[PDB]
Amino acid sequence: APQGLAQFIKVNVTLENGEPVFIYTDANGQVCQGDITVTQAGTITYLLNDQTLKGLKFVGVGFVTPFDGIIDAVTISSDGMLVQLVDLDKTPGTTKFQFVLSNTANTLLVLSPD
């Protein structure tokens, strides 16, 4: 049975001058730049650590180029704390995405930086 690799990133969110700041840490707890290289088919799991007091929850993963084939699917937990990407690593190249989150302070969606 073929298998792949499961990668993990923690999405830590704080505020600075009242606005979100996203800091990524790896499975060792170390700050990392947040980008992931996929060298064979697998998954990437992002865990939200909301330290903003704004009640953030994932509602999806957004792409300016959603049809580029780099990521195949997005799955989301019912509590908004996890998103997972399915990446079959057939299409070479790079895609950029922004996390999409609801918040409990207002009805605007929150985006991580472009």
Binding site: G34, V38, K96, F97
Partner: peptide, 8 residues
């Protein structure tokens, strides 16, 4: 963030 695919 970004994801970079390097296919096999």
């Amino acid at each position: 963030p970004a994801i970079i695919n390097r296919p096999q």
